[PDB]
């Protein structure tokens, strides 16, 4: 029940959302992995720009 003034607000937590929460504890581990993989790809394409084409 609403009590005296406030946004009549609609949250979208009626489905079973806690079954599909996606945490981000990866992200540092991820960020590194990309970065290694990046440095490897440079080293493979030896004098070619790391960039791409």
């Amino acid at each position: 029940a609403p009590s005296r003034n406030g946004m009549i607000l609609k949250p979208h937590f009626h489905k079973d959302w806690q079954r599909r929460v996606a945490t981000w504890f990866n992200q540092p581990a991820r960020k590194i992995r990309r970065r290694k993989a990046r440095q490897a790809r440079a080293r493979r394409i030896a004098p070619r720009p790391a960039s791409g084409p």
Binding site: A1, P2, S3, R4, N5, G6, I8, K10
Partner: protein, 147 residues
């Protein structure tokens, strides 16, 4: 910080701050915005005048970038450029007037709030107000349309 919160101070007391005549039952009003019309109506129509009902035209595939038109007021037009354009001017003695490309700085329209200092300009912009035009002319300048 649980340490600071209220339930630490309620420990010992029976009702936990929810009273003992009426209690803390689950959902006595109904869940959420239930009763907007019936039984919660007064709150809705004294803090949300106009919740209920349709109005105006539908618009199916709205794409916001078509209507993109960020405005800027004369108020702070000179802010767009380095002070030393506004200084090398009120000086110079050619009656030059420096250009101000407003679209470069990220505003499309030029509306007309504020006093513009007596110091000629050439304002390039996608759109202008009527008043913004007038003020600009009164300074001794020239509005300039750009695509």
């Amino acid at each position: 910080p649980s340490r600071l919160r209220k339930t630490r101070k309620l420990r010992g007391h029976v009702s936990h701050g929810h009273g003992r005549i009426g209690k803390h039952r689950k959902h006595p009003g109904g869940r959420g915005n239930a009763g907007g019309m019936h039984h919660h109506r007064i709150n809705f129509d004294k803090y949300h005048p106009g919740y209920f009902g349709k109005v105006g035209m539908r618009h199916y595939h709205l794409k916001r970038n078509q209507s993109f038109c960020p405005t800027v007021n004369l108020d702070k037009l000179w802010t767009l450029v380095s002070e030393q354009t506004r200084v090398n001017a009120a000086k110079n003695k050619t009656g030059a007037a420096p250009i101000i490309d407003v679209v470069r700085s990220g505003y499309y329209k030029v509306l007309g709030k504020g006093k513009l200092p007596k110091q000629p300009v050439i304002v390039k912009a996608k759109f202008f107000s009527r008043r913004a035009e007038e003020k600009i002319k009164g300074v001794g300048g020239a509005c300039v349309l750009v695509a």
